[model samples]
Target: EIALTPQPAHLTVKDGRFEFGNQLKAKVTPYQGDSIRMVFESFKKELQEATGIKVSSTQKEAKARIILDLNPQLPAEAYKLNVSKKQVRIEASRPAGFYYALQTLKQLMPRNVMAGVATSDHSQWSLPSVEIEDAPRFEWRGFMLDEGRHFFGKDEIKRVIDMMAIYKMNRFHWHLTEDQGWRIEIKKYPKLTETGAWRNSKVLAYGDVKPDGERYGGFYTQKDIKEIVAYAKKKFIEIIPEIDIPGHSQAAVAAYPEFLACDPRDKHEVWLQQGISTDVINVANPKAMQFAKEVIDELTELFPFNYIHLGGDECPTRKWQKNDECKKLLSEIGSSNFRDLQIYFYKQLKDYIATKPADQQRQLIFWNEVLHGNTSILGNDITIMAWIGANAAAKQAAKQGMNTILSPQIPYYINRKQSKLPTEPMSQGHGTETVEAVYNYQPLKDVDAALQPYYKGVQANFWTEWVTEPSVLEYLMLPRLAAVAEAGWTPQEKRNYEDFKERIRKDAELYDLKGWNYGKHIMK
Candidate 1:
């Protein structure tokens, strides 16, 4: 028979096994034997790796005995641990529940395990051994990086994925295509890398002097991309590649100016400067869609992940608004305005991509602006990534029965400089975010019950146009990146900013040992 009770007296560990005066005992159910064995093994391995505590299976019998109960509908990813009569009984419906229970057990261990002071007057630790029902709010918890703007190499990206995995972040949003550079290799369109990939001279750090006419920009070959995708997958992160269309196509325009509407009259080369422009494809021409499809086909071959981000934001309608053919396209498509034209473009692209095989039926993600006024035509199959603000766009998407990912710029934009400078560092603007700011942020606010499930996990964007070097990127991301991991992985109710801060204060040692240029607060 299984008996459950809270820890009656304070429990401590003297050697490898837990010790207590008033401990509970019960028979382990036959159904729970496998789960108990797996959990015990996992706990032993993790403890040994993290703390060098050579806990063995034989040691299990030395601790207070407890029974396990499997409640199938209790919670898919939850557990309850109660220490009663000096005995700890853990109950959960799944292995993940056992995993979480082990985590709680770690927290209960002596703060100074090496010194053997398992319990102290200051250690007033208690966790409610109650029922918890939980699961992920959304499937895609993602972050995007603009490597074209700043250029992070393979190793740098790997490190970023490591950080992402720690937080159970599932998606790596790669902004590979932009005005600054075209980063992927398209064998049929060699000019993309040959002409559009490289730029003349990257801007210097904020306030730093720069020489003119130096060439910059880089691209990943098909092989390099495959390697990155495989590496990210090993860490359980999916890489979604973005190819901006219509707008932010300066690099593509530079490579093949014929693809644009004003090619003959306005043959000026595109520069690597920031901000929006009117250099968009003339949708009236079938050739423009063909070119976009070619790039998409090449990208589809490279990334096996199901989600593909077709940048549908900040598209200028100046040329389309004036062109007679575009006006005809809008009228033919039953669209009244240029915004409708944009929606038509997205829908057309979505249809074209959907023609591929089931494995190739990528879930197209777009900026919130894509669905602003003309969402009805946008289709429910697409996922909306809301970067503009809080739950505004996310809630709207949910109301429309569409899935969404929330990435508010005010809190998650890591590209903004950490500190303000007299002159822009590498032509980047004002530095706004602090470590504490990023650590304390929460994606969801109190909202109606219907809108709650639409709230996907949050992401911190690292726009690197101003960040020129890998070391600078590392320095900026660390500690704060750790905070983001904790925020994403730990439940809002369980989070303690002060506790997290203290944990980073110690974990910073690992960064220094790795020879990283980590910030000072992390060390303290």
Candidate 2:
């Protein structure tokens, strides 16, 4: 009996056990193949704690072989695992596959194996003899973190990357900038970190709620970014950093008023009024465009990930309508609509990004709102993350020939409270997004068949507004993340919520073994 969340497409169990004696040491002899050597290294280290198996690189060969096969017939993330008494083979088409196959192997072991419990006490560590052929249904399975709202530091980020990898997730969309604070260092714009990272006060909630009058924020140094990137690269998770511009520029504009269109020389406060910022950066200004280009240039250098997530959501165009400079550009463009100005912003940014060296040119990923207004600029280069209005905008984007990543807020929003267990901490609104809800998401099931290819994948977002630390963060994430993992990886026919819920408990036990605090109501 085995419980694998995001269960394998094909599995076969035989009537035997792959025996592991605590006192018995095994050398992992690499078989003829191309695999992530880094993965094999990690797997050996993993086995030491999990199976009390000592894998020596320099030691003589033993029959307990670790084979890494580059099977061409399989897809990019496909992998096959064949485990017998004599040897264990993890065959895959890519590094992520090898990485994921190891996770499955770890899960297949006894629960205590995850707790660093292996010892040389002569006890047996055994795995049910099994064969697995696994592959993900979607190319982009992601977890988004909004550090701008509340900064969870480097170790916390690394913990997330590790857990995400265990769930077979590959994308870590880090929301690095916001109206509240900026969380990435930019050499060209020192104040983005210096002045914008900390605020005298942070809005705890909307309406009559008083500001939490404390220094609230932090930014990752370039060193931290590189370190985290390297760590995730080992796990095969792409580090995608987002610098919210145009709309979420209150923090940046507060640092340097020059970035704004409606000259904010009168006000020099970094923390603007809460909720959506009406004051936006003047994209029409050549200097402003240059400023954006510089930020993107710096970001592209820091993060080598192909998609540059330029937030194009919730641009309350109220101020742009009456602003003098904005109106001048509106007249020049021969339109009075404020939305048209947003398209102009997108076009200018996209054009400048294209000017980079061919290989260095990364595609821009935007909120579905960016595609709202009309623009003659059409290219399959952009990736639209469908958020609002039930992924309708994502469908529209795909119809327009752009790739899409579905993250509809109705269910995939992990920030919402996960079920009304009174033991759970208070989040302002949109209460309780349970594991059941996550398991129910169908990314492109109802989309027009022609647009299916363009729906690249599904992403679940964790906007840490109420959540501050890692423990609470892990609580809301784990079981639900596993559910999403199944929805994104296993085909619909292979998926069942009860099965995923059951498999997730093993994950919860692993979390407990690692001393990670997680939600408990679902288990109850």
Candidate 3:
């Protein structure tokens, strides 16, 4: 029986067992290209982490083989994995195929094979014979980690990336800034870290008891950022940095209060913790616009990726109604209200980010706000990450000729609790996004067929408002993340929730073996 998550397009259980001989340490045969060996090397490391089996990269021939089909002519990122008693062959159009194929190989083995630092007895080191043809229905399989609200160090971030690789995910949306903290280090503005990064204290979790106080905050250094960027690149994952502006700009404004148009006597904390903040950026101020350009310049120096997510969401404009600078901008641009102010700000940031030197022009990825309130973006090249629900904002974005990534919060928000288990840890919001709900979600399925082409892919987000530690985060993510990953990989017609749940139940054992936290209430 094959219990693969995001079950392959075509799979058959063959009559055989591939025994792992004592000398058969997993190694790649290709002695040439660095591209070919690096991925294998990574898999080798993961194997050791999982099994405590010291597998070295031997140039000599072995039982397992990851063969890159030079002329595979397969669809982009598609792979064909075949395991026979003699040898294992994984054919892919590119290096990504080999990597993904190896991931599938990990799943076919016993759950305890992935146990950390525990040498497996030779008895259970055998795998089932199977032939799998797998390809993702969507190109962008993203996992958005909110490093903004709660800080995760370099190693912790890399651990998440490793897990993503195992699931065949390709995109990492890094939420680096928030109202409570500014994570990325911007050199031009030293105060961003000196002030914005640290807060007097923190709430233990959203709507919970506050921490009995001390300086509680952290940020990633430029050196740390470089290391993480290089690490993710090796795994074929792109990290999109989101320095939220306008709405979530309180932290930035808190660092340099000069960016505010409020009364001089009004108070502004360097970092905010409780309640909905009223400190949206003073978009009417030209110097504030210049500051944004400088920050983007600093960000480009660090991130070389073409896609940058400018968070154009959740900007409450009640503060702007009476400000003098707001009136000045309204008079100068002939704009009507704060809604127009937000649209104007989005255009300025989008146009400026495009100008920075890169191999390819920068792309604008904003939230559903770009489509709401009839805010018409000039360029159709913009991408919208819709989060309201599967259909609401996505339909409008696609119909407007904008490419959309369906990340509707209902099912995709992993931060939402896994189930109603009595033992479940306290979560920030509601606990509606169950594992079954994640598996059942069909990205872009609700959109008009003609406009559906504009729907790019799907993503699951983990916001750390209530999440405190790595284990807690992993508990919220796993099992359900398996569902989201499969949601993006499996074709719409091929998706089955009952089948996915069963597979998740099996994978949960792997988590238990590895000592990695995972949710099981929904599965049980």
Candidate 4:
């Protein structure tokens, strides 16, 4: 029997199997591309670590047992893997395709190999002869981690990326700044990390109750970000760094009080409690705009992705309505509505980004609330991540001819409890979003066929407010993370809940070996 999470697009089983042992050699017919070189190197290292077999690559394809053939005719991110009794061949047109093929091949091998153990018992270390062709249904299979509320260090970030690579997911939406903390260090803003990163205490077990009393926080230095970016690049995943602005600017305001509209004299601390803060960045102050621009300057230098998420969610206009700077800016722009100030805030950032060098320029991503007001002035180059009332907002974004990523809170908000069982770990929300519920979500059910092209893909977000521990975070993401991964990769017609349950059961064996804690309720 063969089991692959995110089951292949098409497959057929054949007689016999190709046994793997010490002498296994891969012949990557020499190519000019650096992308495929990284893919090959990653595969070689993983294989060696798993089986204690040093797979030497050779330019001579004829002498090799495994072959990676560059077929220009295949789709860029599509691959065909064929295994015979004597030899194995992988055909792909691009590096991403080859990377995915390797992931599928790993799933076909014995679970012990993936556990990174050198097993002398080679009986089960062979792959059954099979022909498979696979490609993802959506290009943007993503998982977002919010380090703002609670910081997990760079190593944990890399671990998450590694898991994303295994499931053939492409995007890593990093929510870097929030009211509680700022997680990425900007060279221009030393206080952002020094002051904004640390908080005296954190909320524990239920809202507005007691503090954990532990001083908590950490930030990724520019060097750290570069290293993580390089690591993710090798695995073919793009890291989208989000420096939340306007609303979630309490952390930044805490660092520099001048960012606040109401009063520079007013004291603010890195928020110790959960929930939205009224503090927002002063849109009237050009210096505040400069702060955002300089931060983006660092972000652009760090993350090479084509898009940057400029969070426009949960922003209250009360502070703007009362502040002198906000009033002046609003009057100058010929509008009285405080909400229009948000539109101006986003516009300024968008304009600043446009002035950068073409290669450095990035399109922006905003939450669905950004679509609430006058979108007449907003450009079409933006992407909307529809989270609150995602279906309505997604359709709205599509109707406006903007690209959208489906991230409905009901199911895609994986930070919520996975089961109603008493044993379930503490989480942010009250509702139960089971693994099956996540798997069963139809992202395109309400999307019209004509406007469907605007529907870019799907993403799952982990808020991390209630998740103070790393193990708890892992417990929340897995199993359900697999379900979200499959939703973005496999087509709806090919999906079978029973079949997925069976495959996930097999995957749990690997998860156990890797020490990943996952929700067991769905398997039951």
**How well is each residue in 97-167 modelled by candidate 2, as lDDT tens digits?**
77788888877887666555555565666777899999998889899998887788998888888778777
lDDT of each: 0.65, 0.77, 0.76, 0.85
Give, for candidate 3, the lowest lDDT window spanning 10 residues: 62-71
RMSD of each: 7.7, 2.6, 3.0, 1.7
TM-score of predicted structure 3: 0.90
Error of 2 at 185 (Å): 0.4
Model 1 vs truth, CA RMSD: 7.7
Stretches of model 3 off by over 4 angstroms after superposition: 24-34, 48-68, 112-124, 204-211, 271-274, 358-360
Task: Give lDDT tens digits, candidate 4, residues 50-70.
Answer: 776667766676767899988
Q: Tell me the number of clashing residue pairs for each predicted model.
A: 13, 1, 1, 0
What are the runs in model 2 whose C-alpha is more than 4 Å off?
21-35, 57-64, 114-123, 272-274, 428-432
* lDDT for each residue of candidate 3 in 352-453, tens digit (9 for 90 to 100): 767755554678788986566546654678888988855777787777788889887888888888887667887755667888888887676556679878
Best by lDDT: 4
Clash tally for model 2? 1
> Which regions of candidate 1 deviate over 4 angstroms?
1-138, 204-211, 268-270, 322-327, 334-336, 419-431
TM-score for all models, in order of appearance: 0.75, 0.93, 0.90, 0.96
Q: lDDT score, residue 521, model 3?
A: 80
Give me the overall lDDT of model 4. Answer: 0.85
Q: Kindly indicate the candidate among 2 and 3 with the higher lDDT.
A: 2
